Every structure is written in structure tokens, then in C-alpha cells.
Design a protein around this ligand. Structure first.
Ligand SMILES: C[S@@+](CC[C@H](N)C(=O)[O-])C[C@H]1O[C@@H](n2cnc3c(N)ncnc32)[C@H](O)[C@@H]1O
Ligand SMILES: [Zn+2]
Ligand SMILES: [Zn+2]
Lengths: 292, 121
């Protein structure tokens, strides 16, 4: 486990029907396994990408990736820099944040995510959005809206079939509809980076979007399941995986992209999507705008 | 103190000279340049599409090491061009404490692709 980029929520825990409890994790100081001159977020995104390398991501010749919540207090975009490193050269990478920052993305959009519009579909959506103003361990823990409502809509409207997502959540920062949407992928988890394993943070990862239910997930229940897993399975901090970057870059799969009608999407092509040897979207000029 | 250095340079007629003066005054170099995890088996060239640090360098995200990006001011390049943003910069490890200053003070060899005086020829 220590050698892995992190730990994914086991099937056994996904399958429970737990009541929602408080998360008993806390995250002191200070990131004990981050190498001396490296940002936590560089380490975190590196392990996220390492984990994504283990899955059946579709990687088209002209891949499109959009990254929400890419800014930071530092005025720079560490996660974007890691994604740029990981993704194939020439990959279109657009990032965004409420607050101004400088980044290595091809385009950067400043503003609330709700102001971001695009008619084009995407192959991979990454979100590290998090509201700095929600209270830590308190009264109740209901499903959160805000940017989460936007993401659910964006996924449903703007994610290509076969595409994938990774969305940051925590004990308190989560949304029931997002969990439900996980049931519309070929596969999902549940991923905690080894470098931040003392935190209730995880990335909800949906691999190979199917645009229709594959399983019926209840969000309130699944988050309770997630919390129960975290509560009963301590994970020791580890940066082992950071010390071998030789196989880091996302594999150049040359994944077919096709525009297909609903009536053309049969069992054979669903199986390609699940495998994931196919992306279904148009290939029009990409226009992403922040207005207004 | 980062807020200050960035503003100090952003509101100078010659931001690069201002950064130099600021440093000579004992001011701290610009922080939060984004250091990448990498093999240290790269080509060692100055500015590359992916991290290319050799055993004597660190690789940083380019935009974070550019004074003009970081200060949110115009670049000195003829048109709207930054040679660092979107790319990675290899910085000698001995100079890794001040990547922005390094890129300001030095020049890339047009034949080697390596930093003049730090690996070129
Ligand atoms: C934990 S920080 C992300 C750090 C960043 N991913 C990195 O690589 O260092 C959370 C970010 O989400 C952003 N955010 C929160 N709500 C947002 C919203 N509604 N629209 C756009 N960005 C939002 C915040 O501005 C903040 O920059
Ligand atoms: Zn620049
Ligand atoms: Zn030379």
C-alpha cells in the first residue's frame, strides 16, 4: 500500500448502506512526507495522475482537458503544472478559478465556475474546487450545492462519452447528485492520495462516461459509506511513489474519436466505451468563454 | 513579503532592474515557483515542453518563474509573447532558490538550447 500513489475505496465499502457519521480524521502539521522543496499540491496531483495511469482513460490524438479550481492562495497553479506535465504534448488544457492566478494552461478563465460556458465536449474534467468558507466539523452535514451543482450540469452536458472525471471532495465538501452521477460511468471510486492520507479529502473518479445509468447510487448513502471507510481504515502517509517518475506521462493511446447518433450507439460501442477505446464527441473548434 | 516584491517590480519603469535592486537591498527572492517531480535524467536544456532537468538542475513550471507573468504586467517581447508560460524551465540547483531572478539574469544559447554559462558548449 505504501508504494501505491494512494488508496481507492474498496468495493466492500461501496456496497454498504451506512448511516452518516462524523469523520474522525484530523490533519495536523505539517505534511510530513512532502519532499523539501515540493508543494503539497504538486505531490497530490502527481499521485492522482499516477493513479489515473492505472485506469482505462481514453486519450484521443487531440485531447481536451478542463481543470476547475486551478488557482490558489499562492497566485500560481501547481495542479495545472502537473497536468501539463502528465498529458500528451499539444493536449488542449483549459483551467479556471474564481480568483486570478498565473498558469501553464493554454487558456485560463477567471470567474465563478457558473460563468464558464462552452459548446464543446471534453475528454477529461478535473476539479479541485473547494469553498474556503464552509465550517469544519459542525452541526449537520447536508449535501452542498454551489459549484457542485455547476459540475453536475457540466458533466451531463459537456463530458464526451468515454471521457473521465476526478472531482475533489472532503467530509463536508460533497454533493449527493455528484455521487449519483458516478453511477453513469463504466467504473468509479473513491481515491485518497498517500501524501494527504490524514485528510478526509478524496477524489471522486468516474472512468469512461456512459451518459446513462449503469448502477443506482444514492449520494447520501454513498458518502456515509465513504466516511465509514475513512473512519475505520487509517492510512499512513507515504510519498514512496513520488521517487520514481520514469513512467509518469499519460500513455499515448491514440483513442478513436467519433461523432455518433443515439441510434448508432449499440452494445458493441458501449463495450468500446467501457474499455475505454472510444470517445464520442464532435471535433469543432473549441471556444471557452467566461461571461458574464 | 511576496505581495510587496511583486508590486515593487510591477510599478517600476524597469521591472527587471527593480527586482535586481530589490534583491541587492536584501529582499527575499520571489517564492512559490512551482518545482516539478521528475527523473533527473533529462536533456538539461533551458526551456522545454516537459521537465528536462539533469542531475544538476530542478525543473519548474514556466509561468511561475516569469517575472512578467507573476507581476501581471506586459512582457518585454515585441508582441504578446512569453517564452516560459506553458513550458518548463530548468534551473541550476545552486540557483534554485531564485528561479525568477535566474531567468531574468541569464540567456539561452540559440544553438545549444542550454543556459549560457551553465551547460552551454
Ligand atoms: C484548494 S484550492 C485549489 C488549489 C489548486 N487546485 C492547486 O493546484 O494548487 C480551491 C480553489 O477552488 C476555487 N473555487 C471555489 N469555489 C469556486 C467557484 N464557485 N468557481 C470557481 N472556483 C472556485 C477557489 O478559488 C480556490 O482557488
Ligand atoms: Zn511570462
Ligand atoms: Zn550553446
Amino acid at each position: 500500500q505504501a508504494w501505491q500513489p494512494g488508496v481507492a475505496m474498496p468495493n466492500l465499502y461501496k456496497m454498504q448502506r451506512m448511516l452518516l457519521e462524523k469523520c474522525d480524521l484530523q490533519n495536523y502539521g505539517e505534511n510530513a512526507v512532502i519532499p523539501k522543496g515540493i508543494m503539497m499540491n504538486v505531490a497530490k496531483y502527481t499521485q492522482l495522475c499516477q493513479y489515473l495511469n492505472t485506469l482505462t482513460l481514453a486519450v484521443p490524438y487531440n485531447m481536451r482537458v478542463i481543470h476547475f479550481g486551478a488557482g490558489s492562495d499562492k497566485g500560481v497553479a501547481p495542479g495545472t503544472a502537473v497536468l501539463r506535465q502528465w498529458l500528451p504534448t499539444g493536449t488542449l488544457l483549459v483551467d479556471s478559478d474564481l480568483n486570478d492566478f498565473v498558469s501553464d494552461a493554454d487558456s485560463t478563465l477567471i470567474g465563478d465556475c457558473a460563468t464558464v460556458h462552452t459548446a464543446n465536449k471534453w475528454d477529461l474534467i478535473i476539479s479541485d474546487m473547494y469553498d474556503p468558507r464552509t465550517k469544519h466539523v459542525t452541526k449537520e452535514n447536508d449535501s452542498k450545492e454551489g459549484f457542485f451543482t455547476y459540475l453536475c450540469g457540466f458533466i451531463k452536458q459537456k463530458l464526451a462519452l468515454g471521457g473521465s472525471i476526478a472531482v475533489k471532495i472532503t467530509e463536508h465538501s460533497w454533493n449527493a447528485d455528484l455521487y449519483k452521477l458516478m453511477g453513469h460511468f463504466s467504473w468509479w471510486t473513491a481515491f485518497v492520495t498517500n501524501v494527504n492520507a490524514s485528510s478526509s479529502e478524496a477524489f471522486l473518479i468516474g472512468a469512461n462516461y456512459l451518459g446513462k445509468p449503469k448502477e443506482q447510487i444514492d449520494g447520501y448513502t454513498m458518502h456515509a459509506n465513504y466516511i465509514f471507510w475513512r473512519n475505520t481504515n487509517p492510512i499512513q502517509l507515504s510519498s514512496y511513489s513520488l521517487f520514481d517518475m520514469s513512467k509518469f506521462p499519460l500513455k499515448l493511446r491514440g483513442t478513436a474519436v467519433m461523432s455518433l447518433k443515439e441510434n448508432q450507439i449499440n452494445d458493441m460501442i458501449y463495450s468500446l466505451l467501457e474499455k475505454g477505446r472510444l470517445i464520442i464527441r464532435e471535433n469543432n473548434r473549441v471556444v471557452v468563454s467566461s461571461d458574464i | 513579503h511576496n505581495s510587496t516584491v511583486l508590486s515593487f517590480c510591477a510599478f517600476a519603469v524597469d521591472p527587471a532592474k527593480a527586482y535586481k535592486d530589490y534583491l541587492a537591498s536584501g529582499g527575499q527572492p520571489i517564492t512559490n515557483c512551482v518545482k516539478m517531480l521528475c527523473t533527473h535524467t533529462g536533456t538539461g536544456q533551458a526551456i522545454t515542453v516537459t521537465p528536462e532537468a539533469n542531475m544538476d538542475q530542478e525543473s519548474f513550471g514556466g509561468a511561475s518563474c516569469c517575472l512578467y507573468c507573476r507581476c501581471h504586467i506586459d512582457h518585454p517581447n515585441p508582441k504578446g509573447f512569453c517564452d516560459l508560460k506553458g513550458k518548463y524551465v530548468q534551473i541550476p540547483t545552486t540557483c534554485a532558490n531564485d528561479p525568477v531572478g535566474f531567468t531574468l539574469r541569464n540567456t539561452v544559447c540559440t544553438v545549444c538550447g542550454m543556459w549560457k554559462g551553465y551547460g552551454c558548449s
